[model samples]
Each structure stands twice: as structure tokens, then as C-alpha cells.
Target: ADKICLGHHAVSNGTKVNTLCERGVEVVNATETVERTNIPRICSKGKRTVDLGQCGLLGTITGPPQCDQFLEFSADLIIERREGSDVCYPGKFVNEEALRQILRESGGIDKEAMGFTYSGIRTNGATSSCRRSGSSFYAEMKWLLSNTDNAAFPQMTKSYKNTRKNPALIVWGIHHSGSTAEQTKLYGSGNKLVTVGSSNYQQSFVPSPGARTQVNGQSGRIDFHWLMLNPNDTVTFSFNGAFIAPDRASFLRGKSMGIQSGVQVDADCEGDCYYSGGTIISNLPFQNIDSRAVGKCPRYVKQRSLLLATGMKNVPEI
Candidate 1:
């Protein structure tokens, strides 16, 4: 029984655990560690539902129907995690029954021990679309946010339980807003100017059950990060806490909410890093400006828009 910070806990190796039911100490294997004293609960999630929320362009001020345009839309999320893996791109209308069915089925009830949240918005195939101009139909800035609880983890891991909250190898797919052409492959040029982000969570081991389980839990703040990409270029940003759910003003800092830059490290880290006491990653994890990885736009539209992502210089293409 090692003394551990009351604020943190975890489980790995297909093992399950908690902080001794609040005694805040290891209960099973000598695992579960902490970074700081001020951490969020393991039972909650991040911001609620939000809007298309504005974004900052990579290069221009405002012109053509480029990424800099002030975009807005009524994205009425008919479903969250209950929908199938393939959600119709852009989204559409379904009236109240769609909403009722969702609630009656699994809405509000919570799905996945920690799966990504999504909404379906139908597209009239608005060729008059804004992202790529003309009669195209897809433009998005999908952001995955989390709390500053556990700032870092691993690239991939085996599924482990007892430890619950967010997921590892996490990514939220944004069904694009376009047409038939966009749905086909080829990674077209329409969804060029887009930003995709994910907050660094205290790795909740791969997922649930051996097959990814679903559990009901509270929802609170999670890590926050996003990348604004236009074709090959991207602008990066992030902040300490969730500060804000949809963080409308992410491009620039607001409170503890807006984006904060991190020191760009290539291979491993340049100095000290660990997970539990002495473990893996930005784990000793003091909030130092840091950053990774990128993705060019996606290859198809009907699919969640792509985010080859970047650095704050490098934007992770690097």
C-alpha cells in the first residue's frame, strides 16, 4: 500500500482498480499513479453539446469562401453515441421522433465506458458550400477535448478496466458536410481548411471489456486540443483545462480555457517524463507548452472530415 495522491488513480494489464474507494492508495497491483494534486474525478466527461463554433484561418484574413469565413449552422444532434459507426455526413432533419427514439433507446442513459460523441446533420449537398466554394458539401473543424487530469499517456495500449474515464488512441470522427462526390474516395480538396484536435487524457487503457464496454457515469471537463488545416498547412492550439466546452475562442487565449502552446519534441522527450511515480510520458506532467502528429485532409467526404493536423511550426506534420 503505497501513498498516492488522492486526486489520481488508474489500472492497466487487463487489471481493474480504484483509489482504495477513496483511501486514495493502490488497491490491486502497484499501478495507478498521479501527476498533480488538483485532478478531476474519474466519473465525469467533457463539455456538453455545442455549435459549428467559429475558427481561425491558417493564412488569410477573409476572402474567397475560404477557411477564414465566419461560419455558422444549426447542428441539431439527433444522436450522440447510440448511432452506428457510420453517421450520415453533414447531417439532416428527422423531427422529434428521431430525438425521442434516441432517448428511449440509449440517449441520456450513456453509452460506451468512454467512446467519442457524434451528431448527424443532413446536407442538401449544398454545392454552394463554404469550405471549398462552388456546389461542394463538406467543411468541418472537429475538436476532441478533455481535462488536465492526466496530461499524457501512450500511443497504443491493451484494454484494461477498473480504471475508467477517457480512452487511449482516441479520435472523434466528423461526418463531413458535402455531396456524392465528397463521399467517394480520393481525399479531395473540399475539406481542405479544417482543424482537428484531441485533449491529452490519462489513458483509460484501450477501452472496455476486451471488446470495449459501455458504462453510465458523470460528465465533466476533459483535455482540449485542435488543429486548423488548409490543404497541407495547419495551425495548432490547446490549453490547460477544458476551460470551455466548445471553446469558441480557441485560436486565442481567453481564460484558463483558450489554447496554450507546447514545446515541440520530436522522438521521445528531451528531458524527464513519466506516468505513475516513475512511468511513461509528459507524465511527471507539469503543464509545459508542448505539442505531435498531423494528418492531411481526409480522402473522402461522406466520411468524417480529415485532419492531417500540425504544430503551433511543425503543427504535428511533424
Candidate 2:
């Protein structure tokens, strides 16, 4: 008792603050339950009871308190599905989970699990661990709903860490409007920090890692794109996923997807491309002419991440 820090240990219902769901943006379902490990489970004034995880470190927080820290790195994985000849919607929409779980696995800490799918998760590449984060449950949804940033997306968690010394809040997600593009949106470390690809789901020789390993040569592409953004630059960008060909690109960042456009405007297209909301530029050459489809396409490309001021041509975003 003397060594336990009341502020750093998991309470009885410590996991309650986290939001979990099977497949909805604003959902925490029954199939999922909160799990705690070494943390004490007691019915005290401020604590309740919790579920259990597999194998890992316990915690010392609750719904609100724990959520507060996780919020610092929360993000909205916006799904961009359109209705037209240019869309092959994914079977799964969103899997907004939070980090911090008591695992039944080996050598894990602050592992996030819950929701349908999650970030920080393992592909067929390796075993796996906690994903991105945690949150309040379904019945206790008011906590999740309290977030006015659209019960869905509204952020790009931690680009600063993923990138470099950039101090800014980055917004990453898809913008679905009167749209079409055959390219994939890319959120790089530099260069065309946001660019497009010329490939479709299940496409071979695609060059991108996620595109290849995600499928088994029979299905196609994920019709999706992953992003890393700095939450500090909230006033500047937004991102989305890619699908099909030139007509299925969402965006890596755009001005139209935000609640309101401020200091940021759309990037320009060097060649032909589709720009999402004027910011997410998808350059389609033989495919769909990205700018011709959406407008404001950037001609920058790179191989060593977007940290370099000058972009390079790595692979096509078709």
C-alpha cells in the first residue's frame, strides 16, 4: 500500500475509461470487456471492477483519468467510402481502439486492444501486441460521444514522434465527396509529404509493403492507406486511404476534410491527379489524371520518408 502510487495504478474498474467496439466508430460492444492484470480490483469510492487481459502489466487509472493521457495520442481513422463506379468499400470500416491493456501474452506493456481492427497491430508479418489506444465502453458511451470531433475521425495521433522535431497536430483521414481517382494516397515522412500511388487492392508489383502482405493474391488491395501525423498542426492537414485505381483515392491530407479550412490550402499537382478537398493530391498519369479528377495534386515523391525537403519518385501511387 505504501509503495503503490494511487495516481499510477489501475483502479477496480480502471479499464472503464477506455472506449471499445467490434466495428463502429462510436461503439464499445458486448463481445469486448475490460481486462486488468496486477492492478488491484476493489469496490472503493471511485473504483469498480474490471475484466481481464492475457499477460502483461496492470494499470493505475480509470475511464476519465486514463482516457486523458490516451487522448494526447488519439486519432480518427476516417473511412472514405463513396457510392459510384469508383468505390469498393472495405468489409470493415473503423477499429478505433486505445492503448493500455493487461495482456495474457508475453513481455508487453501499454498494449492497446479493442474495437474491430486497430493500429500498432501486427500484419501477417509477425506475432502482435497492443494497438493504438483505449477508451470508455458502450453502455458508458457518453465518454466516447463526448468527443465532438465526429464520433469518428478528427485526428492523426503522433507524427511528431514518428517524424522528427515537428511540433504540430496532424489530421489524417479520408474525405468522401463528389470524388474518384485511381491512385493511393500516401502520408510520407517528407517530400510530397502527402502523395498518391497508382495501384489497386490485390495488385502485385505494387511496390508498397502494406499492399502486398495484406492480401493473398486473390482479393486485391485493402482499399485503404495508413498515416502518421503530428497532432500539433491541427490547423493544417487531413488524410485518407486509397483504393481501386485513380478513381478510388481518398487523400493523405486535404483542406476540405476538416471542420473548417484555416491556414492550409490544397497542394498542387505536378502532373495529372485527384486532390481530396484541394489538399490530398493523387497524381494519376495513364490511369485517371488525379488533378483532373479531384484537383491540387503534388508532383513530389520520395523513398526515404517525407523528412527530406525534396521529394523523390519511389513507386507509383496508382
Candidate 3:
């Protein structure tokens, strides 16, 4: 019966948990200490079922060739975890279904949490035969504390308070608009930039899962980018970046040679969203920004295009 913050309610090796969301603290017993080692990293699942012809990327059978068979980055999440062994967890991919299931079975705390959301987009890919330009994709993570009634217990505090409503944490993924080869050549280029705000954020890219040398695939990489934050908050960004499962040993262990991947979460509306005390609660029980992973996509192709299409191009890479 120790007094602890809502975020610290996570009790390991114990089957029972007491969470205070509303009314009063309630107890629930569940075995297994489901823990996440690092923050969620966006990874690529390669091609998925998307409507290219309906989206104008593909031409009618009668019409001559327009753009080549579209190559897209199907986004998913890859998180490395350790389970009683010296090595990392075997599974590396996560989907929305698994996310919900894990949260449901883990504890009652996550069920009532509020205000965190996530997303990813398919970057247009190309080759010499067919190429689609001006098309872009992105992956983004955001949490806001300014919402009404957004109150939660801080780690060391005795009572719940709305003190976390200061800054928003966003990890966004941006893509290049060019041929597949060109995109690969530009990998790790300046086009991929990460900037933060007490308000919002910027964008960038990475390769598909473990297969770093894989061409035409786009993933989100968090480590190799530059970050701009409250200065005091830079420590919040440090965590173990994810690699494809097979390549975990060489890159994850050695630390010098790991490739990155991005999971495609899409459309402005269909992406996965999480409800937590705020961004801070999501990181609880582990690193600064941590959580179980989930992803989805629905073909996004507006906003940015509209800005550039007209002449009013000032959209940050969100």
C-alpha cells in the first residue's frame, strides 16, 4: 500500500495492480510484467494492398503506361524487449490489434489513460520504368497535455495533477520525392531533419526493417537525426533504436552498425492513436518515451501537395 504516482503503479513480479483514473483506486490482478525496453520505432513492412490505379498512380488498361508499378513503404512498428534472457525479445513487429491486446491484458492503468496519438504514410517509390513525383509519405508520434481534464499522477507526486501539460513530444518521419534509386542515394541526407517545439515538430526517414540494403523501402530512424528541444528535454530523446530481427546481433549488440526501419501508418484519420496521462506517462516504467507498438495506413496525398501545388509551401514535415 505504498503511495506512488499513477505512472509508477506498474508493479513487476506481482499479479495485482491498483490504478487511480477517476472515482478511486481500483485493484486488478494480472500475471506477467509486460515491459518495453525502448520507445517505439517506425519500421517498414514493405508493400501492402493499396489502390494505385484509383489514386491515379496507375493508368487504365487502354491508356499507355503512366507511372511504373508503385513501390511503397508499408509501415509497422518494431520494438526490442528483453524477457528474462540476456538477449532481446524474438518478436520485432507490432500492429494495432496486438497493441490493444497487450494493453488490455497488461493492466487497468493503460485502459483509462488519455491524449497520445500516432501515424505513418507511404512514401512514393520509383525506378527507370515508371516514376511518381510529388508524392510523399511520413510517420509521426505525438502527445498533448493541454486538453481539458488531462490530469494524471506524476512519478514522485502523491496526488494526480495536470503538470505535464507543458510540451508535446513528436517523432515524425519524412520521405523524399524521386526515383527509388535517387531516394536510396539520398538516404541519411539533409532532407531528413528532426526539429522539436514546445508546440509541434518536423520530419525525416530510414530504411525498411533489418534489410538495410533493401532499395525502395522507407522506414523511420530516430537516432541518426538532429533534434531541437527545450534543451532540458534533450535527455528525453535517448533510447535504443530498433533494427530488423535478423540483424539484431551485429547492429543492436555492437551499437555501431544497425539499420533502421519504418512502419507505415497512414491517412490523416486511419492511423493508430493512444490514450495516456500524456506523453510522459507513455514512457513510464522505462525510458523517457516508451510504449507498446502499433501501426496502420490509408493512403495520404493532400496537405503538403496543396501547399506546394499552389505556391504557399510552408508546411513543416509533420
Which ranges of candidate 3 are over 4 A from the true structure? Answer: 1-165, 174-180, 184-318
In model 1, the worst 10-residue window by lDDT is 251-260
Report lDDT (Cα) of residue 71, candidate 3. 22
- CA deviation > 4 Å runs, candidate 2: 1-46, 49-193, 196-218, 221-232, 235-318
lDDT of 1 at 90: 25
Candidate-wise lDDT, in order: 0.23, 0.21, 0.23
Residue-level lDDT for 34 in candidate 2: 17
lDDT per residue (tens digit) for residues 126-229 in model 2 = 10121224321211111111122112222222211222333221111222211121122222221112233221211111223322223222222322232223
TM-score between model 3 and native: 0.16
Total backbone clashes of candidate 1, pairs 3 or more residues apart or in separate chains: 40
Q: What TM-score goes with each of the models?
A: 0.15, 0.16, 0.16
**Tens digits of lDDT, candidate 3, 153-213:** 1111011112232321121222222344333333322222222223234332333323233
TM-score of 1: 0.15
Question: What lDDT is reached at residue 59 by model 3?
Answer: 14
